[PDB]
């Protein structure tokens, strides 16, 4: 008959004095102990409903999709995106951009490469680079970002960038820094007190600046595309958008605007790059800490694929152990622990509570990924979490790192293909080493907010043979 129960708030501060210094997620997990799976937290001036566990999350996103499919704000990036692009759009804008993005992220036209082939080619470029790396120590972040960025680039720009391109690397650095700043303790505080903190210097201003710098490239690329556009033969996603723009130009309210073009494109690149690369970063740190897992994956690669033939998506069904390892990397790395904020679009009943229209909702994906009923000892890295007694792949409904329902990650298929192909192609060709003994490796995230970000680390890729 009212909102879900929760800690008693104070005017101005909301529930600040009841929060945990370790961050938002820890805070909400402490509230879950007391209130259960459905509760309200006042983040500064705003009530936010938290939903925990796969049952509550699925009930909201799947069974009640007519109410829970709205997109909420991330305070650190809202001043930039301002509801433009598919991630941060609502209503008809979202309908149009989602439909457009889904179609263009999968259909490239006659005589164009499949997603699979794009990844396989990028994987071969990566192996070549790693061979030329001379077994040197590196932080692999730049390469994990390059390979994933290049998949999106091939779709959006119709090209890839070279690993040596300093201007490409500058953009990748901006994505990396931005994701870290957003996920920082300041970024989390801003979620509570943006109304006040927006008047002062801080990370929010650096985030704005970083994003506009990336956007500057996108805008210029759009103009280059427009100058060379052949309506009979669109080259890429940008061309296809420009054609819709032309078609709808007599409509002043067309969603196919330049602001949607720039910011949808930026949205796709940001999500397409930072998600998969961060997962890869964690994945290889985990392989350094658990070398027996990496050794067992390599044995499976040897037995199924061999040393020379490039891995392909068809190999997945015959590689239950490798698939389990990747599932477990995703489960353990818990990329977006609180997902991306939703908003309720209409007055709704949920488990006896009344949630008014326009009430922000966080689906705490982390609580599903760490559910001890689905994953025994969920705090530990263990590929057996995704294997049955016979060593066959055991998929589970608790595995929801891409979320669920209408807003489900539109890049899920691309991401899974990237994870499998890049992971297997690297391990086929290289073993890993570092100066830190497995027992000494610390998996504690460098940042844990909107994103869970692994610590920096050094690694060697040693050619096999
Ligand atoms: C390991 C990799 C990835 C993970 C864990 C992940 C996870 C997520 C999550 C949790 C959401 C929020 C869904 C919600 O609102 O409930 C999301 C949304 C989104 N993702 Fe991903 N994602 C990944 C890779 C990608 C890739 C490679 C792309 C680009 C092709 C992408 C594009 C998007 C877009 C455009 C949205 C916004 C969807 C919408 O609001 O309609 N993601 N993703
Ligand atoms: O349009 C005006 C602006 O242009 C010049 O900046 C350039 C630099 O000339 C130029 O070197 C540069 O090259 C970037 C190529 C790499 C693109 C990487 C993409 C990866 C995926 C997401 C989009 C970016 O891109 C920037 C934006 O075009 C300038 O740096 C800024 O003065 C100026 O604000
Ligand atoms: O819609 C597909 C989604 O549904 C699930 O299978 C539920 O477990 C998720 O793993 C997947 O992301
Ligand atoms: C979908 C997303 C993945 C990571 C961060 C939040 C969005 C982003 C702002 C691109």
UniProtKB/Swiss-Prot annotation:
Heme binds at residue 409. Induction: By phenobarbital. InterPro entries: Cyt_P450, Cyt_P450_CS, Cyt_P450_E_grp-I, Cyt_P450_E_grp-I_CYP2B-like, Cyt_P450_sf, Cytochrome_P450_fam2. Its cofactor is heme. The modification Phosphoserine is found at residue 101. Changing residue 460 to C: In allele CYP2B6*5 and allele CYP2B6*7. It catalyses: N-(5Z,8Z,11Z,14Z-eicosatetraenoyl)-ethanolamine + reduced [NADPH--hemoprotein reductase] + O2 = N-(14,15-epoxy-5Z,8Z,11Z-eicosatrienoyl)-ethanolamine + oxidized [NADPH--hemoprotein reductase] + H2O + H(+); N-(5Z,8Z,11Z,14Z-eicosatetraenoyl)-ethanolamine + reduced [NADPH--hemoprotein reductase] + O2 = N-(11,12-epoxy-5Z,8Z,14Z-eicosatrienoyl)-ethanolamine + oxidized [NADPH--hemoprotein reductase] + H2O + H(+); N-(5Z,8Z,11Z,14Z-eicosatetraenoyl)-ethanolamine + reduced [NADPH--hemoprotein reductase] + O2 = N-(8,9-epoxy-5Z,11Z,14Z-eicosatrienoyl)-ethanolamine + oxidized [NADPH--hemoprotein reductase] + H2O + H(+); testosterone + reduced [NADPH--hemoprotein reductase] + O2 = 16alpha,17beta-dihydroxyandrost-4-en-3-one + oxidized [NADPH--hemoprotein reductase] + H2O + H(+). GO terms for molecular function: anandamide 11,12 epoxidase activity; anandamide 14,15 epoxidase activity; anandamide 8,9 epoxidase activity; arachidonate epoxygenase activity; estrogen 2-hydroxylase activity; heme binding; iron ion binding; monooxygenase activity. This is Cytochrome P450 2B6. It comes from Homo sapiens (Human). The gene is CYP2B6.
